[PDB]
Amino acid sequence: LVKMSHPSGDVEACMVQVTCGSMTLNGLWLDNTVWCPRHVMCYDALLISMTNHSFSVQKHINLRVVGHAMQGTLLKLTVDVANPSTPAYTFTTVKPGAAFSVLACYNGRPTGTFTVVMRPNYTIKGSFLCGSAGSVGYTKEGSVINFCYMHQMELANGTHTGSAFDGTMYGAFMDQLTDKYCSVNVVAWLYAAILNGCAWFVKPNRTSVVSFNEWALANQFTEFVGTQSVDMLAVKTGVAIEQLLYAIQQLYTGFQGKQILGSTMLEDEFTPEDVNMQI
Amino acid sequence: VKMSHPSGDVEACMVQVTCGSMTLNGLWLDNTVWCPRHVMCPADPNYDALLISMTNHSFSVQKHIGAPANLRVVGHAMQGTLLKLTVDVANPSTPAYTFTTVKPGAAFSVLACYNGRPTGTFTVVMRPNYTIKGSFLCGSAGSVGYTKEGSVINFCYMHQMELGTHTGSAFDGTMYGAFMDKQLTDKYCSVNVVAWLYAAILNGCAWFVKPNRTSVVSFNEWALANQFTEFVGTQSVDMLAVKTGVAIEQLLYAIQQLYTGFQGKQILGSTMLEDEFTPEDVNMQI
């Protein structure tokens, strides 16, 4: 169980530096559009101020802006060359629990890649430093990149949020509720444990989904919504979801010194899908 | 956070290499294609005998990603546990690169591929017992590990086999841990745990800083028997000590006490020690 990212080449070919006089940051160049965060201008009062000439766009790894418009918290810029390296792509909004890959850029140059889970409070726990705004987060399905995240801002110590390519900001943070454990990702992690022969925490006892969900409300756990990749884990292991829900309820109390997949605590950063592909 | 290098450049060099009924991945720089020699083994073999057996067209080399291409194998050779296949076309996308063997504790990025197609990228640290803990499946042999410094890629690993751990070879041909294509007890990597403590201190968790210090030389002889690695300082560690005002010899003491058990307390939310983050890591990320 490693944290696995999608290969970043497709997206590396679309990152650019976009500047608005004082402020500079990262942009995503798809076909004839450069997307980027709108606080490059730092709102409608800011937008009217601007000319096409007020932005300049560079590819490091020759673009003239010839159209500009605002969409939610994102600038949608039009440019006079269509990106020859543009992937087949899609905009989609992720839901808490889902995992995606982030390409962290600076000055329009990619520097790292990692995987985050969209956290129940609509933030992500990544590594973003000054100037990383406009790094994109994506998933890949076939050859179709799904762009789902443009990085905007840091809120607390090591917690970040961003936009969803319609303009909306995850969790509506203007440019935080308490976090919870993602119950299904934990269940999947415990299946991964069982699959690698770490099944000491399995007892016959069970907890229905309906009661677990009531229990979750009081213990900073999200609702559990089973899906088929979980059902596939249950089948291969012969352990029912309802058993693992009982074990979550008792492991949250304490691990009593023991281990699971090396971990001393619960792990909600792997999804049923990630477990399936990897194991 | 576990952070790997952008895989773009490396994806641009991944090939599929076929030999008889068997296929795996190769790396294509200049006119050379590297790949694991066990591509030649039908379902304890004699790799010299095998290579004599190989004619010109025993090898097929397909590029799937990017600009598809047909690469004829012009000559072949062997090198350690790898093959050097020469091909008539040169990778237009070869970048600036080196061939450096990594040491235990160091971190590198892996580009996992199947039938010449990248599928994922992650980061491992080379274990003191010379294995890595990756996610490799059937057909992943020949996936490439690498680190970038400046615009220069240092290729350091070509995946070979599953032991549940993994190993492959370096690009001179040496298999890491000298395993054979036909395991020591792990150890804690001490320099990384120093780094990780520094990341605890740099973030506020420093209840284990006591002024008592244990010397490097002593820690090492101590480590010899409590399953740690010799501690080696680096310029990177020295930047973490400076910024925090805690000396390496102090954390070597804490590591001696902390092996016994965290005794009810917590460090960055863990009760066992993390050896998977390098001083470079903590420096880059803080």
From TrEMBL, chain B:
Residue ranges of coiled coil: none
Domain (Peptidase C30): residue spans on this chain: 1-286
Superkingdom to which the source organism belongs: Viruses
Subcellular location(s) of the protein: Host cytoplasm, Host perinuclear region; Host membrane
Function: Forms a hexadecamer with nsp8 (8 subunits of each) that may participate in viral replication by acting as a primase. Alternatively, may synthesize substantially longer products than oligonucleotide primers. The replicase polyprotein of coronaviruses is a multifunctional protein: it contains the activities necessary for the transcription of negative stranded RNA, leader RNA, subgenomic mRNAs and progeny virion RNA as well as proteinases responsible for the cleavage of the polyprotein into functional products.
Protein family according to the UniProt entry: Belongs to the coronaviruses polyprotein 1ab family.
Protein name: ORF1a
Source species of the chain: Middle East respiratory syndrome-related coronavirus (MERS-CoV)
Lineage summary: Viruses, Riboviria, Orthornavirae, Pisuviricota, Pisoniviricetes
